[PDB]
Design a protein around this ligand. Structure first.
Ligand SMILES: [Zn+2]
Lengths: 38, 121, 74, 52, 134, 123, 52, 47
RNA sequence: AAACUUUCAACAACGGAUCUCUUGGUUCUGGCAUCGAUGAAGAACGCAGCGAAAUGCGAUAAGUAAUGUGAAUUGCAGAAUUCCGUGAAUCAUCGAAUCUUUGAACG
RNA sequence: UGAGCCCGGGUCGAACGGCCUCUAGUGCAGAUCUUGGUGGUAGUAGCAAAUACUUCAAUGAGAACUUGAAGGACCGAAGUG
RNA sequence: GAGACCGAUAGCGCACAAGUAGAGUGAUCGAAAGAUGAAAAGCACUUUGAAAAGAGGGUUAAAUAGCACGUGAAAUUGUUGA
């Protein structure tokens, strides 16, 4: 709801961060196998 | 923008605080002017951060050396300066106590200790 | 709802009425564990997390839990 | 290993259903749910006469 | 034949250690032989490769190409010899990874550390040569 | 790679499309309609299918399909208008025509010697 | 708000009439520092902040 | 009283309760047909 | 005759079997004895120039001190190293430090 | 005789076989068998109610269901606010 | 440190960002998923296409290896030939 707490606001922020896609320069590292975010 | 740990050891407390202050002031001014046109100023800021960590380590190390000299001949020491070991090792009997023996046992070993011998074939 | 977030284990298994975690039993000092669920034991056993301090013990043992500094150091 | 093919929770659905009477994994949110188990004919199942 | 119990002959463990070695270990694995002139001058057979050295490639498509070492890419066990390059599609030149075992060092980058390295290897070689000789 | 490997690529022009999101059955029938035809005749035919002036006969995949008088030209009653399939075939024919221009062939004499529709992994 | 005002005054020599703060959704804090009428924000931003 | 449901159509391969059934039910198959003949044959032979 | 149905062949599809490989598992054997109120095991949130996860670390935050080695890191960009040197390194070792909120958890 | 064995042609790229002994998780058409993949049915059943949509211009490669204007309808303050 | 063991439907559920994704109010349940090439040398440039892509041209021993990437069976399908 509109009423929340800073701590749960921070957790909601982290969930957004983990949804971010994969940077392109990761895919060019030697020995890399990561293609798409899971 | 990188300080050497070797130079910091010779310098004393008052000089170290001046270096720590000027490193932090430099980092504070750099960071605000870094928000625009990032570049070669980025690694200078990174080198500044490692310099701050280096000076903090030397300041703490010298202070603990002074305290250990102060507590050299005192019965109780701060838990920070006490040896860590493990919880079980800390509770273990001291070497002097675990080696203590009864007086009657000592008398028997004094006059009847294990000898060296051989048996012919 | 019937279950809320548990502070000790992080799961949404804290009963709102009984105020007891269905997974770890937070108000109780001991962590809930049962021998009829080997899968449950291995989910929360030592080694499933960070191992902040106990990872550093073996190196200190290998050197005898020594104290001091190397001779001639600066 | 003595626990190979055994560390799963499976139960036969019954006789009146038009499916083979083999223990099937419960659940419902995975590819594994509803799959046969505990049998030497079953993928990821216990082998016959496990080597001792 | 291996004798000491601490030595292992497992293929699985040898390949794991080789491909997961740290940078310091990889430096030893990335060694190259010394030239014949350098062998009779220093009484040393091999030495780990480094950036300043001059090498002559003796194996691969680059038959007898000489040049100075440019990079020691320890992450993929390759070295970059100067002017030993291939053009991409765009025409930009990229270096060709040469293994140190495929080259021979002709000129050695000299510094106090490497004179110490050569002296220690020579000391062992002459010690056993006289031990075996007499 | 292509299936008709008996044609020298120097004397021909080719086009290809993969994982195309059109009905396989509809595309197969309309490809069979223009098989062996001239390029310009096929292009006019495929346009006419879009405007419902000519119809594509449904030979194999024609289960419960309506009847029209436009199928009388082919000798069948079941004919249809695969608009989507025609549009995709137009693009490939135009692309193959463009590749023929680059090589230098005569577009007025080209015929569709080989046309094939295969199945893609399903969605 | 008290800490931000003191930090601005002691370090960058900025006097503020009031400071309004909010916590952004990502978890960072934003401070709106309104300056005294005597000083100019544009002049301070150009010199001490490198901002145009 | 017991509703016998044949495991065909939408009832083929269902883990639990068929949709349009109220109380105590029972599922049947062809495989059970051969069984019920077997137990009946054994009981009749023994009776 | 064509079309359709079927059989075979060539090529092309669908699909991932077979062969080959393996920083994995499984079993046996040997040396050794080391968690925690000096705050453990577990949970959470932060930290990289460009990172989501895994990994590492804790506002000194992909790390500090010391020791050894001896010239890198590398996906890109930017700094280095004067190399006749207290000295690169996502290096190894490791005796000194820093170590946010909780959690036996303790105003 | 048979289970099978051998060769030729094509594809492929890194290990394999004959002899004789030893050993076994050693030979499938079925088990409403397990997992995976794929068919006919089939371009078939079907894509519901909320009366209702229409004209020009713009965007755009592409406009019944995107926008502007105009028209025709509607919720009708216990609303489709 | 080893094996007359298993070799990606096998071997531990997990050879991979696996007790992960996901399911359940919860206790708990619980997968799938390895392989381009010696080296990315991962296709410059030209042309058609709105684009996705296609065709030339090129790298390579090989593209009958183009990241839907070693080899590529059968079921099932297209074209051609009878
Ligand atoms: Zn709990």
């Amino acid at each position: 709801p509109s009423h929340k707490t800073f701590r749960i606001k921070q957790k909601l922020a982290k969930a957004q961060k983990q949804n971010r896609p994969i940077p392109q320069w990761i895919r060019l590292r030697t020995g890399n196998t990561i293609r798409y975010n899971a | 923008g990188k300080v050497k740990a070797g130079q910091l050891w010779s310098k004393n407390k008052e000089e170290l605080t001046k270096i720590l202050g000027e490193l932090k002031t430099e980092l504070s001014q750099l960071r605000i002017q870094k928000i625009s046109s990032s570049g070669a100023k980025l690694n200078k800021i990174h080198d500044l951060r490692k310099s701050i960590a280096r000076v903090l380590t030397v300041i703490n190390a010298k202070q603990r050396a002074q305290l250990r000299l102060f507590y050299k001949n005192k019965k109780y020491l701060p838990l920070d300066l006490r040896p860590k070991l493990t919880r079980a090792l800390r509770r273990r009997l001291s070497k002097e106590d675990a080696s203590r023996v009864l007086e009657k046992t000592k008398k028997r070993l004094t006059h009847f200790p294990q000898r060296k011998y051989a048996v012919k074939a | 709802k019937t279950h809320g977030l548990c502070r000790r284990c992080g799961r949404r298994s804290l009963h709102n009425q009984k105020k007891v975690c269905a997974s770890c039993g937070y108000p109780a000092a001991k962590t809930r564990k049962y021998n009829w669920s080997e899968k449950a034991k291995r989910r929360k056993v030592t080694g499933t997390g960070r191992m902040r301090y106990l990872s550093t013990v073996p190196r200190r043992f290998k050197n005898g839990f020594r104290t001091g500094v190397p001779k001639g150091a600066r | 290993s003595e626990k190979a093919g055994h560390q799963t929770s499976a139960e036969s659905w019954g006789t009146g259903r038009a499916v083979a009477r083999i223990p099937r994994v419960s659940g419902g949110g995975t590819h594994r749910a509803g799959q046969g188990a505990f049998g030497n004919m079953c993928r990821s199942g216990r082998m016959f006469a496990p080597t001792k | 034949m291996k004798v000491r119990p601490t030595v292992s002959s497992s293929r699985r463990k040898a390949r794991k250690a080789h491909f997961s070695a740290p940078s310091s270990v990889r430096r030893v694995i990335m060694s190259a032989p010394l030239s014949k002139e350098l062998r009779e001058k220093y009484n040393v057979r091999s030495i780990p490769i480094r950036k300043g050295d001059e090498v002559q490639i003796v194996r691969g498509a680059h038959k007898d190409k000489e040049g100075k070492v440019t990079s020691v890419y320890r992450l993929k066990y390759v070295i970059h010899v100067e002017r030993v390059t291939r053009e991409k599609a765009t025409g930009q030149t990229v270096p060709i990874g040469i293994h140190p075992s495929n080259v021979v060092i002709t000129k050695l980058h000299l510094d106090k550390d490497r004179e110490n390295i050569l002296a220690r290897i020579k000391a062992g070689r002459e010690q056993v040569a006289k031990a075996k000789g007499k | 790679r292509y299936a008709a490997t008996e044609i020298a690529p120097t004397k021909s022009a080719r086009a290809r499309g993969s994982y195309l999101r059109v009905s396989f059955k509809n595309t197969r029938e309309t490809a069979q309609a223009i098989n062996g035809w001239k390029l310009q005749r096929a292009l006019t035919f495929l346009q006419n299918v879009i405007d419902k002036k000519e119809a594509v006969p449904m030979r194999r995949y024609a289960g419960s399909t309506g009847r029209t008088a436009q199928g009388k030209q082919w000798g069948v009653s079941r004919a249809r208008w695969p608009v989507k399939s025609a549009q995709f075939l137009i693009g490939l024919l135009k692309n193959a025509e463009a590749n023929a221009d680059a090589k230098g062939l005569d577009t007025g004499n080209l015929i569709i010697k080989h046309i094939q529709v295969n199945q893609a992994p399903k969605q | 708000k008290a800490q931000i005002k003191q930090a601005l005054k002691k370090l960058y020599d900025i006097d503020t009439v009031k400071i309004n703060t909010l916590i952004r959704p990502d978890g960072t804090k934003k401070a709106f520092a309104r300056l005294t009428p005597d000083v100019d924000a544009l002049d301070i931003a150009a010199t001490k902040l490198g901002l145009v | 009283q017991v509703k016998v449901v044949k495991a065909t159509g939408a009832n083929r391969g269902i883990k639990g309760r068929p949709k349009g059934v109220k109380g105590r039910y029972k599922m049947v198959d062809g495989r059970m047909k051969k069984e019920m003949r077997a137990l009946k044959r054994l009981a009749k032979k023994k009776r």
